[PDB]
Amino acid sequence: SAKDERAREILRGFKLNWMNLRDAETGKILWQGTEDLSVPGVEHEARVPKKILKCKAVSRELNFSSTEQMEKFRLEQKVYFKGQCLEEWFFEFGFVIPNSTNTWQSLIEAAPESQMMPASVLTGNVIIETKFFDDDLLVSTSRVRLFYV
Ligand code: NI
């Protein structure tokens, strides 16, 4: 076999079960998703309350299942607005026990420049690109268009 086939094994056995965003200031739920937004090769949509834009810090929980072991599960997220990369995020989970279900908690501190951009301009015009890696092995690329309601 090969690295390309190993990545497909991990991808085949991977699932995002649920995700939520909390206002880190209060711990109150902003947003809750149950769609597997890790599914690649298509565009997804997420409808998020516009109040998220005025949060200095959001607490994300991603709950995921992996049939395959991963040595160093990490994410690279790029926020695109009108073709322009506004923000770059790097998150690391680390070691994933095979046949495990895990909650990955991340504090996400938005650029202050992003906090004052109007919801009416961002809505429908923002793509989050997520690259799922095992160390340097790219497992999948997923795309979610954001609406701020
Ligand atoms: Ni081989």
Numbering used by the authors: 2 to 150
Study authors write:
PDE6D has been shown to bind farnesylated RAS proteins and facilitate their trafficking and plasma membrane (PM) localization. The results presented here provide evidence of the importance of PDE6D in sustaining downstream RAS signaling and cell survival in a large panel of acute leukemia cell lines.
E Docking results in wild type apo structure of PDE6D and R48delV49del mutant; Root mean square deviation (RMSD) with respect to 3D coordinates of the ligands in the superposed X-ray complex of the wild type protein are reported. In addition, in silico docking of DW0254 to R48del V49del PDE6D confirmed an accentuated increase in the root mean square deviation (RMSD) in contrast with Deltarasin’s RMSD that was only marginally affected, strongly suggesting DW0254 would be unlikely to bind PDE6D in the event of deletion of these two residues.
